[PDB]
From a paper:
[name] forms a dodecamer composed of two hexameric rings that is ideal for cryo-electron microscopy (cryo-EM) analysis. The cryo-EM structure of hinT H101N bound to [name] revealed up to six hinT dimers bound to the external surface of [name] dodecamer. A Cryo-EM density map representation of the [name]-hinT H101N complex. The dodecamer [name] is in blue and the dimeric hinT H101N is in pink.
Residue numbers in the entry:
A (entry chain F): 1 to 60, 65 to 326, 329 to 395, 405 to 469
B (entry chain E), C (entry chain I): 1 to 60, 65 to 326, 329 to 394, 405 to 469
D (entry chain H): 233 to 326, 329 to 395, 405 to 469
Amino acid sequence: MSAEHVLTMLNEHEVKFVDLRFTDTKGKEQHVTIPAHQVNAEFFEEGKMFDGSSIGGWKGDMVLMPDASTAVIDPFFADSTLIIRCDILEPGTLQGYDRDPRSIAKRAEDYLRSTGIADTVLFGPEPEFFLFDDIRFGSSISGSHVAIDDIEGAWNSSTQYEGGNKGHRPAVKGGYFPVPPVDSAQDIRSEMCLVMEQMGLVVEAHHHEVATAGQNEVATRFNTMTKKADEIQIYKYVVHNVAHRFGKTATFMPKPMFGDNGSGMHCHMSLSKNGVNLFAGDKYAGLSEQALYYIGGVIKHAKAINALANPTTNSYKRLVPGAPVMLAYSARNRSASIRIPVVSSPKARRIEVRFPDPAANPYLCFAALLMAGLDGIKNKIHPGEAMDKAKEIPQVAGSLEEALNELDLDREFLKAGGVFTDEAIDAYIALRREEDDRVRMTPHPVEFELYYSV
Amino acid sequence: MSAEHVLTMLNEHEVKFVDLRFTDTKGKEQHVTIPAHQVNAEFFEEGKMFDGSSIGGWKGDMVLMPDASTAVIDPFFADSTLIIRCDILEPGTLQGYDRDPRSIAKRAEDYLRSTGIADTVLFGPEPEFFLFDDIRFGSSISGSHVAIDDIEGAWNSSTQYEGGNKGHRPAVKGGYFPVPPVDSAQDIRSEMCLVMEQMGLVVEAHHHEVATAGQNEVATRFNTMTKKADEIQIYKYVVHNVAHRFGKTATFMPKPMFGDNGSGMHCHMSLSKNGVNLFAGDKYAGLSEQALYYIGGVIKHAKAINALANPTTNSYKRLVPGAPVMLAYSARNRSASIRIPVVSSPKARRIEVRFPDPAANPYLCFAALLMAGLDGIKNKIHPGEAMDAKEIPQVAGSLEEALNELDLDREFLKAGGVFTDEAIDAYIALRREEDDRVRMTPHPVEFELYYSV
Amino acid sequence: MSAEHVLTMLNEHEVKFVDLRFTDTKGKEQHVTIPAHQVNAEFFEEGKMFDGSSIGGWKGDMVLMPDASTAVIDPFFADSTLIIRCDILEPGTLQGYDRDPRSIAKRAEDYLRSTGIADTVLFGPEPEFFLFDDIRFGSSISGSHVAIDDIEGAWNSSTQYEGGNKGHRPAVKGGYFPVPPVDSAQDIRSEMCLVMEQMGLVVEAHHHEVATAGQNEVATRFNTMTKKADEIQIYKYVVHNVAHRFGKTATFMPKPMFGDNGSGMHCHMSLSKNGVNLFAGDKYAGLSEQALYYIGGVIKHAKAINALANPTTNSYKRLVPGAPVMLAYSARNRSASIRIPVVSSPKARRIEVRFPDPAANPYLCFAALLMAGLDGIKNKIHPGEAMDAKEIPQVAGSLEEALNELDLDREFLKAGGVFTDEAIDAYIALRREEDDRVRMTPHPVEFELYYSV
Amino acid sequence: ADEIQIYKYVVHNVAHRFGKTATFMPKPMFGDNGSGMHCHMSLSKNGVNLFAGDKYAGLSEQALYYIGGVIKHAKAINALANPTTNSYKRLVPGAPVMLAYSARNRSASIRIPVVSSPKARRIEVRFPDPAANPYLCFAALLMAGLDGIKNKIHPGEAMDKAKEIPQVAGSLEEALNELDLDREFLKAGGVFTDEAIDAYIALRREEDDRVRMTPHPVEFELYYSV
Ligand SMILES: [Mn+2]
Ligand SMILES: [Mn+2]
Ligand SMILES: [Mn+2]
């Protein structure tokens, strides 16, 4: 699909507006809209100049360069709008901006191709989300508060409702996965799936999740790295907008509630060259030597990866023992962060990395995982024996500060081939350290419950 | 478009009413409606008499003269109405009223043509605005209050709403520019753009701005001075009416909230003669010597300009250090009030003056900027080197300072009869009244600071 | 009164606590309490160490040195407490801290003695205050508010009260000075006077003032500079605490309400040497040449004085024309900021400076006035003829102007080492912080004026 | 320590009698100053102050060695002097966090008060908070000082003049780990027992785990939309 096809769409669908979209360092989607008559052949060659100083980690003019292959009609805007995803390029050389996550992911794929290890990398993430009816939160000198409310919440079993309380609710850790009316999100999940199919995703399934307050997941088909990162951005956009249109509120926080299961994003990975899966072989669980080296690299650089795959303090609320935290690989053990799914055909052999959570920036997380795996392959890092059976077993970072320190001290595997720059890594670390400092310095209601009388 | 075309439009659109519009000194549109059958050939030659004594700064029987080229159908009135912009002429000589902003802008353009420096002046303003759900304000002997409420306001993260609180809101200084549902004004901005295009504006983009409580901007294509002033008036009208129709409330105040970004109107300028941009050259950032002289004039008369480009006390609550307050020109520095945008095509070479605000009267602000630039060109005022510190001049720190500088620096505005001493005095008094009100009313922050001392 | 007398009082009144009090740069009393048994002979020679880094303008271990002559029993604390006023001394040399207002006032008196012009300076200040039933104020990103409520407020003529609304209230600018029940503060003022006399003040009169929302003043007898500054501190303390005990709320703000009279502190001054008033003579209004020179100095340095006598932004909301803003001296004219009261006895001859306000730090304001007068005497500055118009100098129109003039006019304060450059800079910065807050926070009147424009 | 217990009891009960409620939490409010417990220390033998001398700020070699021991075992001490997670919301840069001694510097965690009489010479350790157990905190400070004296741990030059300067523990987990690894100076002389230290560490780790695992409203403010 090209600029000619985009210009044809503009007339086929009577498009009034075009929404240029991109992703910031934190992973949030930013969009700027231009009227359709401003889109011409020169638009796809020169882009649009915008001031990126107001973006989070880009504080120093840059060019928004549309990627026509990402053109897709917006199903939510009242006026006919076309969504084109864009890369941020330097104004003069029209080269990828060092801090652009999409550019970083594209450079990671290019480095993968250059090294000769493989031709394509396949990513399948499995994000989950929470649907709520009401969320209220605030902080000030006088205190702080968070209050989550959902009709499916078990704590509402005593709530008085206009029209009566209907009782049927999923119990705590009991929403996987009863039939309605206990499951009250069937229609919303189906409509999300249909909208995703319209927007270009291939949906594999959708269902309710373990937690009680409307935890749901829509499982979509795998895809190449940058393509699947764009697909994840579309996925989050669709979930948020559908929840808003149904009177709900979607959230991808790793751990919104205590005592109930959190939300994770298991990332399936595979490598292919000339249409041949390189992770298929005669080694453990049908893996290959390349697959074992990839696992070893991911294990070695797991703490550095955590700074990008679990970039929020809330993520380490779910990355606690008792959500796997052990850095080992096993096809059966459920305490291993890395698992090898049992698959019939070798063409579908893959490794599932389970610690990542959906709050991660898709581009940066996937790039970090791929770069760690490639470092493992290049340096032939053997991961050891499978954890089929203990303080010798390495674990994921226990805090965002630890993850950021490890990323600071372990930058080489990300700087290999120019995928990541020291400036980009420093900007990311500072941007996350600001949030970490705020959370560290704000008191805690549990701290009052524990220490007020002491 | 002429009178014959207006009379044709009346039958084509089954127009029932014609709304004659003009701008007062403060910059607010004033409209008087007449039935369509009152519009004939004699109407476009003799105008309509109206009593302007009750207008703000026009206190002493003037003529409303329609400008058919401005004819446009109103998209909001229930009855089919046609909007015609009008100049205010003296009843006898039918010459422009000295205190009419549109007449002043037209005279500024005519002076530009007469001096021979250029044929046309191009202005790209970039106003921003705030959208709110509720605004309450008042004052009395017992006290004074202002309370802003918007669903996008971060402070509503704790508010209880009927139907539940959806927690997707912009953070403070974090509304630039995430996708919905964090951005809740996509449909409103799209409707504004479509209506603006209906009313004759060329839209370039629209987006959410840095501030949290629904700050938005719709960018429109540049145009000649008087045309772009009319376009800014139409822009403000469309924004206000669309926000009203969506249940919102638009404001062009420079600084409605403290601790969040204010609203400004960056003014891009360029001069063209015989179709060639005169601001394009081999000097700094591709500028020409005339461009440098224009920058120098704007810098020299910046404080006087502030009285017209930042005519509200609230304006100087965004023109505070920690900022676009330094009177210097640079292509890279964010601290310079004058920027040279990086444009590949020399035909697009221009200077961006950053200090103005959308509360300014468009006609008067543009005329002041043009006249300062022309004074710089005529007197060959060199702006010095680009700012790539205490000696650097700054914009006026208060409306009183701006008005005093305007009082003491009238010549560059009186060149060519564009501004008249009477008009300048009327403007200064009209603004000094508001300044006195704000200066004499006590402040809640003053209570917070001094109640116990 | 000395240390022996203080130790005797401790047993005489069965004192349980001793409250050491001092004044910060802004003029607020700070108190630290110690048990009575911690007070001994060594206490009055070595003082008490305290950490002043957290005080307003004292940021860098200083000594609180009690002044036994100021010992007085607190009339409000439940436990028998003795109030001793203390100076702030450097720990090593035991010399007055450069930024201690009381030390500055003492040094001003010592300089007056050293120059030989006079032996003593007499100050009669006349502060006024407001009594309210409820005050609510706040500011945030969403807005800001202030709401004053008092039963005497004219706006309460329509309010519904439990038990009924009694309609006897002062009108706006009509509280000077009808009998009760229109005046509802007779008992409060009488209690204030009695407590003040208990605390060592000599009261002359008390009455309701012009404003409606419970403006009152209690007049006290003049006294020497430092003594009268301590008396003013005791006055403010007594007013605040008595109002609190009566369910009211006292404020010494210059201008709490718009459209009603503000609160001022007229400062009467005179100089005496060997028991003869030096301000008595055969010149205008019975003044002497030294009195005229004092007036001339005060006029010359009036703007610099304003930074200390009117140190709040709110102050310049009462120093507005339509007013005591003209820097001239006359015995009859109400427009002159300096008056010569008509007194039969030459011993009572004095000059009344009208612009100061009760929000001023008493020590710093009195020291500034005295130093300006002494500069006028030394340099023989003639104030011209009595003002019995645009050329007449006026007081500073803003706190920024006052602070700039203080920055540029420090010499008359640095004469004799009274004020130190570091102290002046600290004061200027401390006031500029508040000025910046008030300058950057938007105004409800600004919304009323500019929301639609 | 008994006096501190009586102090806390009296404060709580008087506040209750007046209708108020008192708390010794290190940091109940964000954006405003927290509550601390500066501990002044001095050793005396035969009525003679052993911290008086001709060294810096009138200190003695024993005083400097005591300071050095406190600095060396500061992180282990923190597990007892700052035994709550809230404590480390007070011990944040922007400060009392730098482990150095000075008579003037406000950033020094150890301060030497300027006192005329040598008999009153002492060292003030500023990081401890009032949530600490007085007995255990004072015992830890004394044992660290005695280890410094016994091993002649010189504290270096005073901080009268930066990543080389050691800092107090940044979290209760760090403090507990350092206490676990630095038991010897507390176990000297049988004062602390391994069982007692383990019980303390487990008891505090329970609270640390609860606070670590419960989500935060600021976390919602920051991450709900991401
Ligand atoms: Mn799942
Ligand atoms: Mn903008
Ligand atoms: Mn009076």
